[PDB]
Design a protein around this ligand. Structure first.
Ligand code: CHL
Ligand code: CLA
Ligand code: CLA
Ligand code: CLA
Ligand code: CLA
Ligand code: CLA
Ligand code: CLA
Ligand SMILES: CC(/C=C/C=C(C)/C=C/[C@@]12O[C@]1(C)C[C@@H](O)CC2(C)C)=C\C=C\C=C(C)\C=C\C=C(C)\C=C\[C@@]12O[C@]1(C)C[C@@H](O)CC2(C)C
Ligand SMILES: CC(/C=C/C=C(C)/C=C/[C@@]12O[C@]1(C)C[C@@H](O)CC2(C)C)=C\C=C\C=C(C)\C=C\C=C(C)\C=C\[C@@]12O[C@]1(C)C[C@@H](O)CC2(C)C
Ligand SMILES: CC1=CCCC(C)(C)[C@H]1/C=C/C(C)=C/C=C/C(C)=C/C=C/C=C(C)/C=C/C=C(C)/C=C/C1=C(C)CCCC1(C)C
Ligand SMILES: CC1=CCCC(C)(C)[C@H]1\C=C/C(C)=C\C=C/C(C)=C\C=C/C=C(C)/C=C\C=C(C)/C=C/C1=C(C)CCCC1(C)C
Lengths: 80, 311, 228, 41, 226, 212
């Protein structure tokens, strides 16, 4: 397909998850969730070249979780 | 934090202590004074809290002995497939299942006990089977006797791998306490590794074997004309004839329209009014649907990387 | 001292000095060691080098001077000359065995111990002079050189010519085997049209019969590689 | 081999091995000499 | 140093500049500070299977492609230009039957002779100097081995004596691993690239250069032969 | 010492002096010192029956190339009692009578080496007395050429040859059985069959050893 509407969605879903998963939208290796829903710690010492505290594992997490919603929306549309 | 962390050459594998009954608990090592020492031995043999104190000694004994149970279960499964191989009537059952009653065990003639062999079917004499192996083996797409010998051996082979694992993880390389203290790893793995992958793996057996085979049977063919199993996954055009959507390849999976597979992945419910079982198309859609859901649920515990909960 | 070793950078093995004749310090298999083996192996290298040098010349002498009679055969009682051909090879081989079995056993025992019997039996008044294990020649060199003048230098020329033969002679046996041509013949083919006369062609064919029998069904010929 | 014997000499081992020698024998006596009610033969 | 390559806090602690070809990529911390031993997971072993897998891969990759090319160029005959997995190793995928005997005979001589190779190799890993002691056809002097198990050295195994100055020796080793690691992935591709497409790996170099935008993985799914 | 599987060390209990001791006891059945001398005789006996069995198989086979009508080693049992002239029972029960005498005599010299040649078996002292080693009787009858009497350094050098030739006769006599059950033909027939067309006569082509 390459640009058909499901591709509109998925690139705009996963790439959207880790888009600002870069900064402050979701949990990342560094900053972990609290029970009081703070979203702040970030004291983890994994070594990654990157301007601020964005691990390579944060990539796999956010992308892989991006595809659920990515698929859940694309199938939410297709079935409907 | 989560590492392997094992010891080495902890105990010594020898018969030294087999000849010294009761060697484990301090009270039994003194030999029988009375006849109770014979009884008090057995009740205290698997109680590992009386043996020792620390969890390193207890857990190793516990973990290394689970291999024992699994090494026994597999000798058991192997035996059940073997008696399906040689001593069962299975082929005759497989062709005319609505009549022939299932049988495996066969009784040696001696002591006038051969009367236990019942006239059953397929020109055969043996004991009835209530276990239900035959009505599994049809649903696994097992036709000839050769698949059964291959499980009997393969089952009896991997059984020998377990006792070595049992030996290897107690005498030779024994984990430490910290290794058994990792629940969140253990729970990520069991839930994703066993149940998550073990459902896919089986959802991949049904799709390429049972679904095709069990269509050719109730269509009225018999095991003589059924293509060998490796014919199915090594021939598309053979497979596509049964279900046309294999001609679509893996694109529909990747092009993200799964309605394409509605032929061999269904949602039906109810019993198939030929075999009586559940429609075997959706059972693949069953495990597949679960497997995807387990692997998800195995990621909620953090291990090294600070993603996921702790307990 | 290092003369020149076979590969440019290498370490001559400990037991390899260059005391022997053609030493380049090449024994990558490490097979020679514990010199009791070396003495033995040296003997073979000589004996092989010599029969090869005689062999190579004898093959060139055959084909040049007898244009027929493809060399690799020559055995069966067809190619044989006129006085022969009807000497019944089984009686010819008889004449050879008792001759070689003596001389070879005669040489072998002079390897076991040394300087032991270098002397004539029978007349037993005379002997070949001193040597080191395989360089006789009181009789075996009648002409007396390689005695006073440079000796090992002639020894050096002996190996380097010998080793050349063992390879060259080996070329004969495999060339004549695949091509079906004598050495100077297959050479003449190459000079004619090299690109199509090359070893690139005519491999995968041993072109040899598997029977080749004389007084029976005899003598299986197993070629070398299984080219059909 | 020292200690393998001593284990094979334990009570339950012989109890198994030696009964399985009777059991087998008494089984096969009935194979060749079937149905022995009275000692008549 | 130039680790990058997913270097961790722990992964760089014990593993830094030492082992030839160390980029500090060790995500699971397998090679480790000897916290456990006597298994197939430890620095002594994992390094030594990495090298060996490297070398076979090199010999694998070079051996899978070369017959495919030399026949394509019209050099060796076509009957022997069988694609590497169709050589008769995998009868379900076809059998070539070119050989002077059957495959099973060849597999007997292999298993015998190949076992003298590798069982001989462990005893040097389990007993560092042992295989240069007992008499084996006089080969023991050059088969004794030296240093660590991964690099034998000796007379035979290194005959041309390259890496003398220990300056280049590390370089040549690092130069060897980086080719081994590359060689493995190459072989890892073949198995998939042959099952997805169904054609040769060299044939798959042409089809991707004839229509690069099209012939591809995402193009080829509906192919999937076997 | 040149052990089998080079690079290991022998099992610690047997490094000792035994003819043909390579340190091979991978299941450790020599671990009982009393029992080892029982296995050393057990081997020696098998080695001696092997070396007689092998020749007994090959020669009638090799005899059959020139004609001379013998059977193969298998189905030489029938051919004799096919032509019979004496019943099977009388033969097998003369076995157990005469043969059992030797063995049950061979045993009580192993048990107690002193007896069996104290006397009072038809005299014959010192012929049966035994030379003191496990499986070597020595003596007048068992050793008519008086060998193993002179130089001992030459003797210990035979005792090695006897085993090593015995271990090979056993391991070959395992081949005679196994390659009969597959190809169903004599030992020298196979030795010609593989020397004639080596390629299609090999083991993988018997259709039994390599099932499909
Ligand atoms: C102890 C070693 C020994 C071996 C390896 C054999 C081997 C054989 N014998 Mg034999 N025999 C042996 C001892 C003796 N046999 C015989 C006399 C015979 C006879 C008369 C026959 C055999 C036969 C056989 C065959 C198997 C019989 C059978 O029922 O197979 C199924 C299990 C097999 C070739 C039979 C045969 O020739 O078939 C090929 C047969 O008819 N043997 C005597 C004299 C009593 C023996 C003394 O120990
Ligand atoms: C984009 C909007 C959207 C729309 C229109 C739908 C619509 C639908 N979803 Mg859906 N879904 C969405 C987003 C959406 N979803 C997202 C973001 C996720 C997260 C992955 C899911 C996960 C999801 C699951 C797991 C299931 C549905 C199912 C369904 C269907 C029935 C829902 C039900 O049982 O009540 C319906 C067609 C159910 C269904 O019937 O499947 C087709 C069902 O099992 N959806
Ligand atoms: C699922 C069945 C099972 C399993 C896995 C085990 C496992 C074990 N038992 Mg056991 N046991 C069982 C059933 C089982 N038992 C039963 C039914 C009884 C009768 C009450 C016993 C009575 C018993 C005693 C009395 C002892 C054990 C001991 C042991 C341990 C040592 C085993 C060993 O060294 O063998 C290694 C050898 C093999 C595995 C090969 C087995 C081959 C022979 C034929 C059996 C091991 C944890 C011993 C111990 O010290 O544990 C604390 C011990 O003293 N067990
Ligand atoms: C994907 C990873 C994975 C998988 C599949 C398993 C699988 C299993 N674990 Mg397990 N485990 C893991 C990771 C994993 N573990 C980790 C990381 C830890 C450390 C905390 C543990 C700690 C642990 C303990 C403490 C115990 C288990 C047990 C078990 C068994 C469950 C009991 C049962 O009914 O098995 C059903 C059996 C089968 C379905 C047969 C399949 C078995 C084959 C051999 C697959 C085994 C794969 C496994 C990962 C080992 C592979 C590596 C090894 C070959 C080198 C099962 C074999 C229990 C057990 O049985 O102990 C022996 C148990 O007591 N595990
Ligand atoms: C999880 C286990 C599992 C395994 C081992 C396989 C294995 C296979 N599948 Mg598959 N498949 C699975 C699950 C699995 N499948 C599931 C869950 C589905 C439902 C979406 C499918 C749907 C599917 C289709 C539609 C096709 C395959 C095909 C194939 C074969 C070629 C795949 C290939 O070239 O991969 C590269 C390595 C291969 C034997 C293809 C086939 O049979 O060949 C034509 C094919 O067309 N599969
Ligand atoms: C001196 C050493 C010597 C050497 C190197 C050779 C070498 C050879 N001889 Mg030969 N030969 C020799 C002595 C030697 N012979 C002697 C002493 C006699 C008896 C006088 C013969 C009688 C002889 C005959 C009759 C034949 C050969 C043949 C051959 C060739 C093929 C052998 C073969 O394939 O056997 C495989 C094993 C080969 C080049 C044969 C040949 O060339 O076939 C075409 C052949 O027919 N030779
Ligand atoms: C306690 C009462 C009792 C008595 C008196 C008997 C007696 C007998 N039963 Mg019996 N039985 C009993 C309980 C009893 N049983 C029980 C409780 C059961 C249920 C498990 C059975 C089940 C049963 C079956 C199923 C069979 C018998 C049979 C027999 C007869 C065969 C004996 C035999 O093998 O030959 C004698 C054996 C020998 C002499 C062998 C010994 C040889 C040695 C070497 C002699 C050495 C001398 C020096 C015998 C009359 C068999 C029969 O034919 O009965 C009609 C038979 O098939 N019984
Ligand atoms: C050896 C090998 C292939 C060998 C092939 C051979 C000999 C082939 C021989 C033949 O082909 C020929 C010659 C001729 C053919 O006609 C027939 C045969 C006879 C068949 C492939 C290895 C292939 C090996 C591969 C692909 C290994 C991949 C491993 C990876 C990626 C590991 C990564 C990690 O270990 C790190 C890096 C860090 C850890 O902390 C984390 C993880 C992730 C675990
Ligand atoms: C005696 C023998 C053969 C005797 C042959 C005879 C009498 C000949 C008989 C015949 O002439 C007649 C009678 C009639 C003829 O018409 C036909 C025949 C029938 C042919 C073979 C022994 C054959 C015996 C063999 C082959 C034994 C092999 C044993 C091995 C390899 C054991 C190894 C181990 O025991 C150790 C060494 C150490 C442990 O720690 C490890 C393990 C592995 C347990
Ligand atoms: C260097 C080389 C490369 C290729 C082949 C190979 C690898 C083997 C290698 C060859 C090495 C060599 C030199 C092998 C020797 C081969 C040969 C031909 C040896 C001699 C063979 C023949 C011999 C004695 C005599 C044969 C004559 C016989 C019976 C009988 C003749 C007679 C008839 C026909 C019947 C009755 C009367 C009588 C007189 C008996
Ligand atoms: C930020 C930006 C600007 C400057 C730098 C730079 C140019 C590098 C750029 C940074 C990053 C870029 C360009 C890309 C990053 C990550 C990319 C391309 C991919 C990462 C993750 C992708 C993922 C998980 C997709 C799928 C993964 C999984 C498991 C999906 C699993 C699946 C689910 C759960 C449903 C069913 C089963 C299936 C389909 C297997």
């Amino acid at each position: 397909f390459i640009g058909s509407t499901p591709n509109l969605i998925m690139v705009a879903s996963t790439g959207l998850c880790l888009a600002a998963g870069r900064f402050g939208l979701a949990p990342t290796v560094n900053k972990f969730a609290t029970s009081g829903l703070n979203l702040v710690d970030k004291p983890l010492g994994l070594k990654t070249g990157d301007p601020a505290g964005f691990t390579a594992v944060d990539v796999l997490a956010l992308g892989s979780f991006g595809h659920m919603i990515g698929i859940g929306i694309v199938l939410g549309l297709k079935a409907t | 934090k989560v590492k392997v962390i094992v010891d080495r050459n902890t105990t010594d594998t020898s018969f030294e202590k087999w000849a010294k009954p009761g060697h484990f608990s301090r009270t039994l090592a003194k030999g029988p004074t009375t006849t109770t020492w014979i009884w008090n031995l057995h009740a205290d043999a698997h109680d590992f809290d009386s043996h020792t104190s620390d969890l390193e000694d207890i857990s190793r004994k516990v973990f290394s002995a689970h291999f024992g149970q699994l090494g026994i279960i597999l000798i058991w499964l192997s035996g059940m497939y073997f008696h399906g191989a040689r001593f069962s009537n299975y082929e005759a059952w497989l062709s005319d299942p609505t009549h022939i009653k299932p049988s495996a065990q066969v009784v040696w003639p001696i002591v006038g006990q051969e009367i236990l062999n019942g006239d059953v079917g397929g020109g055969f004499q043996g004991i009835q089977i209530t276990s239900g192996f035959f009505q599994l083996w049809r649903a696994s797409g097992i036709t000839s006797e050769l698949e059964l010998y291959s499980t009997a051996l393969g089952g009896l082979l991997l059984a020998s791998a377990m006792f070595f694992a049992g030996w290897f993880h107690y005498h030779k390389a024994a984990p430490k306490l910290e290794w058994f203290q990792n629940v969140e790893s253990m729970m990520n793995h069991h839930l994703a590794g066993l149940l998550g992958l073990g459902s896919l793996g089986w959802a991949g057996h049904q799709i390429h074997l049972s679904i095709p085979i069990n269509k050719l049977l109730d269509a009225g063919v018999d095991p003589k004309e059924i293509p060998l199993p490796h014919e199915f996954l090594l021939n598309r055009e053979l497979m596509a004839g049964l279900y046309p959507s294999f001609s679509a390849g893996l694109k529909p999976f990747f092009t993200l329209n799964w309605s394409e597979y509605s032929d061999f992945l269904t949602f039906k419910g109810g019993l198939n009014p030929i075999n009586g079982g559940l429609w075997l198309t959706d059972i693949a859609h069953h495990h597949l649907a679960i497997a995807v859901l387990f692997i998800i649920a195995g990621h909620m515990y953090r291990t090294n990387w600070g993603i996921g909960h702790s307990m | 001292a290092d003369r020149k070793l076979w590969a440019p950078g290498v370490a001559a093995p400990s037991y390899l000095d260059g005391s022997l004749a053609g030493d380049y310090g090449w024994d990558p298999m490490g097979l020679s060691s514990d010199p009791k083996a070396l003495a033995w192996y040296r003997q073979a290298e000589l004996v092989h080098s010599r029969w090869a040098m005689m062999g190579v010349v004898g093959i060139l002498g055959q084909e040049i001077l007898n244009p027929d009679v493809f060399w690799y055969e020559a055995g069966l009682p067809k190619n044989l000359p006129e006085q022969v051909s009807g000497l019944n090879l089984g009686g010819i081989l008889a004449f050879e065995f008792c001759m070689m079995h003596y001389v070879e056993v005669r040489r072998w025992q002079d390897y076991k111990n040394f300087g032991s019997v270098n002397e004539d039996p029978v007349f037993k008044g005379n002997s070949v002079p001193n040597e080191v294990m395989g360089y006789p020649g009181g009789i075996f060199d009648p002409f007396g050189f390689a005695k006073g003048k440079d000796i090992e230098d002639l020894k050096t020329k002996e190996i380097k010519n010998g080793r050349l033969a063992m390879v060259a002679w080996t070329g004969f046996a495999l060339q004549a085997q695949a091509t079906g041509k004598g050495p100077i013949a297959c050479w003449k083919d190459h000079l004619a049209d090299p690109f199509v006369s090359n070893i690139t062609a005519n491999i995968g064919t041993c072109v040899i019969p598997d029977s080749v029998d004389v007084g029976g069904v005899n003598i299986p010929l197993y070629c070398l590689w299984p080219g059909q | 081999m020292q200690n393998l014997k001593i284990y094979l000499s334990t009570a339950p081992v012989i109890a198994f091995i030696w009964l399985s020698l009777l059991s087998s024998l008494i089984i096969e006596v009935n194979r060749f000499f079937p149905d022995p009610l009275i000692f008549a033969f | 140093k130039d680790t990058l390559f997913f270097a961790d806090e722990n992964s760089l602690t014990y593993l830094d500049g030492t082992l030839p070809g160390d980029y500090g990529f060790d995500p699971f911390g397998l090679l480790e500070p000897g916290n456990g031993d006597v298994g197939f997971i430890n620095p002594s072993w994992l390094r030594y299977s990495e090298v060996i897998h490297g070398r076979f891969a090199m010999l694998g990759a070079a051996g899978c492609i070369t017959p495919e090319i030399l026949s394509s160029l019209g050099v060796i005959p076509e009957s022997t230009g069988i694609v590497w997995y169709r050589n008769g190793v995998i009868p379900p995928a076809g059998s070539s039957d070119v050989y002077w005997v059957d495959p099973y005979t060849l597999f007997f001589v292999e298993v015998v002779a190949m076992q003298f190779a590798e069982l001989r190799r462990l005893q040097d890993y389990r007993n560092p100097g042992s295989m240069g002691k007992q008499y084996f056809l006089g080969l023991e002097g050059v088969l004794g081995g030296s240093g660590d198990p991964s690099y034998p050295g000796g007379a035979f195994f290194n005959m041309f004596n390259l890496g003398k100055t220990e300056e280049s020796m590390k370089v040549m080793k690092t130069r060897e691993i980086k080719n081994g690691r590359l060689a493995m992935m190459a072989m890892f591709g073949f198995g998939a690239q042959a099952i997805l497409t169904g054609k040769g790996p060299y044939q798959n170099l042409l089809d991707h250069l004839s229509d690069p935008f099209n012939n591809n993985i995402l193009t080829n799914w509906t192919s999937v032969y076997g | 010492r040149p052990v089998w599987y080079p690079g290991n060390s022998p099992p610690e209990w047997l490094d000792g002096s035994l003819p043909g001791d390579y340190g091979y006891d991978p299941l450790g059945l020599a671990s009982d010192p009393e029992m080892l001398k029982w296995w050393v005789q057990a081997e020696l006996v098998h080695g001696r029956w092997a070396m007689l069995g092998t020749v007994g198989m090959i020669v009638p086979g090799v005899a059959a190339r020139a004609g001379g009508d013998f059977p193969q080693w298998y189905d030489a049992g029938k051919v004799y009692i096919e032509n019979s002239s004496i019943p099977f029972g009388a033969l097998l029960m003369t076995q157990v009578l005469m043969m059992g005498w030797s063995e049950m005599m061979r045993y009580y010299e192993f048990v107690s080496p002193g007896s069996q040649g104290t006397g009072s078996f038809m005299g014959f002292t010192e012929a049966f007395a035994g030379t003191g080693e496990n499986g070597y009787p020595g003596g007048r009858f068992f050793d008519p050429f008086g060998l193993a009497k002179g130089d001992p350094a030459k003797l210990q050098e035979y005792k090695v040859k006897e085993i090593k030739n015995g271990r090979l006769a056993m391991f070959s006599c395992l081949g005679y059985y196994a390659q009969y059950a597959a190809t169903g033909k004599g030992p020298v027939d196979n030795w010609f069959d593989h020397i004639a067309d080596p390629f299609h006569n090999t083991c993988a082509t018997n259709g039994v050893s390599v099932p499909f």
